[PDB]
Amino acid sequence: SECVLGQSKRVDFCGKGYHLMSFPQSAPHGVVFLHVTYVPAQEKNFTTAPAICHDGKAHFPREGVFVSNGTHWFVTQRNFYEPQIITTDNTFVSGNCDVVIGIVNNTVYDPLQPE
Amino acid sequence: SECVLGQSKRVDFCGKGYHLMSFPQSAPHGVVFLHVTYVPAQEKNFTTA
Amino acid sequence: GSNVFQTRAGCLIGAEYVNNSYECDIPIGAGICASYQTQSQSIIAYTMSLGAENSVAYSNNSIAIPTNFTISVTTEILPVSMTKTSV
Amino acid sequence: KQIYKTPPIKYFGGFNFSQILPDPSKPSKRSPIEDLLFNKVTLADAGFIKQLICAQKFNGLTVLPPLLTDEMIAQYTSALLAGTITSGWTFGAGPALQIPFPMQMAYRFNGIGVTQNVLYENQKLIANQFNSAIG
Numbered sequence: 001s002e003c004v005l006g007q008s009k010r011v012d013f014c015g016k017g018y019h020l021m022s023f024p025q026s027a028p029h030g031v032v033f034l035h036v037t038y039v040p041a042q043e044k045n046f047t048t049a050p051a052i053c054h055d056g057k058a059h060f061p062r063e064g065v066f067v068s069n070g071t072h073w074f075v076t077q078r079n080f081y082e083p084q085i086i087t088t089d090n091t092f093v094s095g096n097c098d099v100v101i102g103i104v105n106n107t108v109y110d111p112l113q114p115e
Numbered sequence: 116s117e118c119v120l121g122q123s124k125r126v127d128f129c130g131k132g133y134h135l136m137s138f139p140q141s142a143p144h145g146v147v148f149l150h151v152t153y154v155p156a157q158e159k160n161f162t163t164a
Numbered sequence: 165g166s167n168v169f170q171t172r173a174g175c176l177i178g179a180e181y182v183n184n185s186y187e188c189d190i191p192i193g194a195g196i197c198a199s200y201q202t203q204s205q206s207i208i209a210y211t212m213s214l215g216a217e218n219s220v221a222y223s224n225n226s227i228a229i230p231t232n233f234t235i236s237v238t239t240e241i242l243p244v245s246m247t248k249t250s251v
Numbered sequence: 252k253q254i255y256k257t258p259p260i261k262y263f264g265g266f267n268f269s270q271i272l273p274d275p276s277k278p279s280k281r282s283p284i285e286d287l288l289f290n291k292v293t294l295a296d297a298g299f300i301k302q303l304i305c306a307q308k309f310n311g312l313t314v315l316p317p318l319l320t321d322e323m324i325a326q327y328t329s330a331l332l333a334g335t336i337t338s339g340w341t342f343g344a345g346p347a348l349q350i351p352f353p354m355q356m357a358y359r360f361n362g363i364g365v366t367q368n369v370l371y372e373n374q375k376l377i378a379n380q381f382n383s384a385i386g
């Protein structure tokens with residue numbers, strides 16, 4: 001009722017890993033489930049910073065993490081590498097650049113200033 | 116499987132209140148769970164629309 | 165008189181202790197297992213290996229992110245009913 | 252599948268974990284809470300070689316010992332705890348990945364509908380409350 005007719009957010013209940021689909025089959029006095037699941041692969045190191053301080057104010061990712069390879073800071077998802085340039089659309093401001101720990105300066109890119 | 120290796124959205128399953136994480140310990144013929152939970156505090160009135 | 169080893173669940177006759185570690189087939193008890201293995205022909209007893217050793221590299225400002233994935237298909241089997249009978 | 256060693260140095264951004272992490276000083280390699288739990292429970296027999304009520308059972312009533320000695324169970328507990336403290340929840344669904352503890356705490360906060368700025372501004376207070384509760 002859970003795995004087949006829907007998608008389950010429970011862990012290890014429907015297969016091992018993140019759950020995608022299920023398929024039922026019949027057997028003598030029993031049932032057999034086929035779980036189609038999603039599992040990550042080879043990874044890379046990165047250097048992170050919990051927040052960004054552009055103009056005396058903190059900045060936080062709307063959805064993702066802040067990473068940097070060796071020269072530029074990017075915001076990405078949690079389960080797949082996809083760097084993008086940080087703009088005001090991907091961040092929300094709350095703070096005064098004095099209370100958080102581990103913040104780095106960098107800068108952001110306004111999308112409307114060029115226009 | 117649920118409370119430890121992840122976060123659970125089931126109400127009043129992994130500890131009372133909103134759930135944050137858990138830590139296991141082993142006892143003679145059994146297991147002991149330590150749940151870390153989040154609970155609100157003093158509140159204020161407001162007018163809503 | 166030969167190949168006699170005393171364990172925490174009685175002594176064992178007919179096997180030789182080994183200082184290596186393997187995933188064990190026949191559970192003896194008290195963390196001691198036994199199996200058939202070469203040196204070419206002998207039954208050996210040893211302490212089980214909990215698993216493959218590993219370590220992480222936790223640090224103040226280090227994160228790890230995957231760049232690829234994989235779709236997998238496992239399987240699960242469950243009984244649903246037994247034979248009906250009458251007397 | 253595997254066993255994860257504890258990090259060499261126990262600093263986690265103000266959080267304290269001495270009461271639950273393994274204690275190398277004790278011979279049993281058990282955490283203080285585990286040791287207190289072990290001491291509190293009074294057990295009768297564990298299948299050890301016997302030679303007064305337990306002695307009166309020479310009538311074919313024997314007690315086999317458990318397969319896993321209660322020393323390697325502590326190894327499993329330590330492995331799971333180290334994995335969940337140094338890798339978040341990603342080690343339960345694939346290869347373990349490192350991540351700083353405050354980031355993991357912020358994301359667990361974000362899970363229940365509280366923006367992470369709350370944590371990043373009240374880190375010290377949260378750490379002190381956690382330490383007091385554990386104490």
Ligand SMILES: *[C@@H]1O[C@H](CO)[C@@H](O[C@@H]2O[C@H](CO)[C@@H](O)[C@H](O)[C@H]2NC(C)=O)[C@H](O)[C@H]1NC(C)=O
Pocket residue numbers: 045221
């Ligand atoms: C990148 O990540 C790898 C792991 O994927 C790190 O490699 C381990 O680093 C620790 C740090 O002390 C060493 O103890 C291990 O021996 C390393 N692994 C191996 C197989 O040797 C690596 O340190 C990370 N950083 C860099 C710059 O490579």
Ligand SMILES: *[C@@H]1O[C@H](CO)[C@@H](O[C@@H]2O[C@H](CO)[C@@H](O)[C@H](O)[C@H]2NC(C)=O)[C@H](O)[C@H]1NC(C)=O
Pocket residue numbers: 232233
């Ligand atoms: C992710 O891993 C898969 C593993 O299969 C990669 O797919 C292989 O890609 C190479 C590159 O041309 C092919 O020669 C192989 O035939 C592919 N394997 C299969 C089974 O189709 C895939 O390329 C990886 N992702 C990226 C971005 O490289």
Ligand SMILES: *[C@@H]1O[C@H](CO)[C@@H](O[C@@H]2O[C@H](CO)[C@@H](O)[C@H](O)[C@H]2NC(C)=O)[C@H](O)[C@H]1NC(C)=O
Pocket residue numbers: 267268269270382385386
């Ligand atoms: C917090 O961690 C510190 C070490 O990082 C612990 O420090 C000592 O712990 C012993 C254990 O009982 C105490 O007797 C000492 O008084 C502690 N000294 C200091 C300077 O902290 C400390 O115990 C940990 N906190 C708790 C509640 O266990």
Ligand SMILES: *[C@@H]1O[C@H](CO)[C@@H](O)[C@H](O)[C@H]1NC(C)=O
Pocket residue numbers: 069070071072
């Ligand atoms: C790191 O990312 C920047 C972003 O554009 C890129 O230019 C650079 O080639 C990458 N690699 C290194 C080693 O800087």
Ligand SMILES: *[C@@H]1O[C@H](CO)[C@@H](O)[C@H](O)[C@H]1NC(C)=O
Pocket residue numbers: 103104105
């Ligand atoms: C960011 O720059 C300001 C002045 O330009 C400086 O005072 C501050 O220390 C910088 N940030 C960090 C984390 O050093």
Ligand SMILES: *[C@@H]1O[C@H](CO)[C@@H](O)[C@H](O)[C@H]1NC(C)=O
Pocket residue numbers: 181182183
């Ligand atoms: C195996 O280890 C023990 C100590 O646990 C040692 O006494 C013995 O010499 C080693 N080698 C054997 C049993 O062949």
Ligand SMILES: *[C@@H]1O[C@H](CO)[C@@H](O)[C@H](O)[C@H]1NC(C)=O
Pocket residue numbers: 222223224225262
């Ligand atoms: C993390 O920061 C603390 C701050 O005092 C420092 O003591 C510790 O050595 C740092 N660890 C790493 C791995 O950078």
Ligand SMILES: *[C@@H]1O[C@H](CO)[C@@H](O)[C@H](O)[C@H]1NC(C)=O
Pocket residue numbers: 300301302
């Ligand atoms: C078993 O016999 C040996 C003989 O040396 C002795 O040392 C040991 O204490 C005995 N154990 C028990 C439980 O009687």
